């Protein structure tokens, strides 16, 4: 699960910020893996990584991406 999730997310990082970080991306996978909707994910991202000002579409794609990992969509 988690390894493929981090990739999908880290790619979403690069496409947002221009940089890449398998750690920061993994923080986010871990944060929202066990949530129930993109808002719960958003609330947790806001806790630590608040200053990024991550847009809704980003928080959607990460919700989407992590979802795809539990399914096997890779």
């Amino acid at each position: 699960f988690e390894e493929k999730a981090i990739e999908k997310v880290d790619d979403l990082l690069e496409s947002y910020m221009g940089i890449r970080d398998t750690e920061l991306a993994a923080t986010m996978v871990e944060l929202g893996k066990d949530k129930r909707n993109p808002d719960e994910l958003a609330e947790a991202l806001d806790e630590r990584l608040g200053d990024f000002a991550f847009p809704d579409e980003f928080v959607f794609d990460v919700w989407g991406a992590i979802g795809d990992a539990k399914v096997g969509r890779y």
Binding site: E14, S15, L49, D51, P55
Partner: protein, 47 residues
């Protein structure tokens, strides 16, 4: 500009930077592009 430039993708920013001739939009994108790296700097040095 009175754009919400936090919605933009990194591609988006870099592209309008070396395409647009709108000086206001330019400085605005150049600033956003900066912000995100500045914020990433602050996160890196802590963890």
């Amino acid at each position: 500009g009175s754009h919400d430039l936090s919605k933009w993708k990194y591609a988006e920013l870099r592209d309008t930077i070396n395409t647009s001739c709108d000086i206001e939009l330019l400085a605005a994108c150049r600033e956003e592009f900066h912000r995100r790296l500045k914020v990433y700097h602050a996160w890196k040095s802590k963890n």
